[PDB]
């Protein structure tokens, strides 16, 4: 007969170092990239792909931008993404974030020559 | 001078490292922990701290449970957790979950002798 204490452990405990570290990814990255300097940027996305692969998106699927612009491009393939969203209890300067992992198509706005990404628009 | 392009790389690129966690963590964990056997549990949280630290919460900030009971306690420090939320497309027996990670104070209900956590109430 499984005890109440053991049941709690089975459904709520996972003492893993890597799991603990991953939970702090956004908190650490938002600070490292100076995104929490004078304020907490509420939302931000990090792409775990090579720069060349992301730059290539500008020569791919031409799509409409969320702000009415037409210089946005969507990736043909899915890419490893990490969504960082500000927590309800977040307080400056200790900006708190929630880490979410996903594989989606990224949409970026491109400008200049070379035609490279200057803004992250969305993921689909 | 930091160009718009450079700023994009600083704000959105993380080519040097893969995702610190999988988006399939919850799907895997809910199954192995037999949390989807009788039904798809709507939501479940996993703590990534040592069992001792979690058990200690039973002797910390006494807070009222969401159900009106007074056998709940809030942790002094924040803990690394993972929230598993059932996806809108999930359907038993094929339970699907969304994985989210953060560092928050936990609230558990304790009872028995020794006084140990028997139910995860909430986070904050
Ligand atoms: Cl902004
Ligand atoms: Cl519970």
UniProtKB/Swiss-Prot annotation, chains A, B:
Phenotypic consequence of residue 119 to A: Loss of activity
One annotated Gene Ontology cellular component of this protein: extracellular region
Record-listed E.C. numbers: 4.6.1.18
Keywords per UniProt: Disulfide bond, Endonuclease, Glycation, Glycoprotein, Hydrolase, Lyase, Nuclease, Secreted, Signal
Keyword Nuclease: yes
Main location per the UniProt record: secreted
Ligand binding (substrate): 7, 10, 41-45, 66, 85
Keyword Ribonucleoprotein belongs to the record: no
Tissue spec. comment: Pancreas.
Any single biological process term in GO: defense response to Gram-positive bacterium
Example of a GO MF term: RNA nuclease activity
Positions of glycan attachment: 1, 7, 34, 37, 41
Catalytic activity: an [RNA] containing cytidine + H2O = an [RNA]-3'-cytidine-3'-phosphate + a 5'-hydroxy-ribonucleotide-3'-[RNA]; an [RNA] containing uridine + H2O = an [RNA]-3'-uridine-3'-phosphate + a 5'-hydroxy-ribonucleotide-3'-[RNA]
Location of this chain's protein in the cell: Secreted
Transmembrane domains' residue ranges: none
Disulfide-bond pairs as recorded: 26-84, 40-95, 58-110, 65-72
Role of this protein: Endonuclease that catalyzes the cleavage of RNA on the 3' side of pyrimidine nucleotides. Acts on single-stranded and double-stranded RNA.
Quaternary organization: Interacts with and forms tight 1:1 complexes with RNH1. Dimerization of two such complexes may occur. Interaction with RNH1 inhibits this protein. Monomer.
Family, similarity comment: Belongs to the pancreatic ribonuclease family.
Entry protein name: Ribonuclease pancreatic
Section of the entire sequence shown: 27 to 150 of 150
């Amino acid at each position: 007969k499984e005890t109440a204490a053991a049941k709690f452990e089975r459904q709520h405990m996972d003492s893993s170092t890597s799991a603990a570290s991953s939970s702090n990814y956004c908190n650490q990255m938002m600070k490292s990239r100076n995104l929490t300097k004078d304020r907490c940027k509420p939302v931000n996305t990090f792409v775990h792909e090579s720069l060349a692969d992301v730059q290539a998106v500008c020569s791919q699927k031409n799509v409409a931008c969320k702000n009415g612009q037409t210089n946005c491009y969507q990736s043909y393939s899915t890419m490893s993404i990490t969504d960082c969203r500000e927590t309800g209890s977040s307080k400056y300067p200790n900006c708190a974030y929630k880490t979410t992992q996903a594989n989606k198509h990224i949409i970026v706005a491109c400008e200049g020559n070379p035609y490279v990404p200057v803004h992250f628009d969305a993921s689909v």
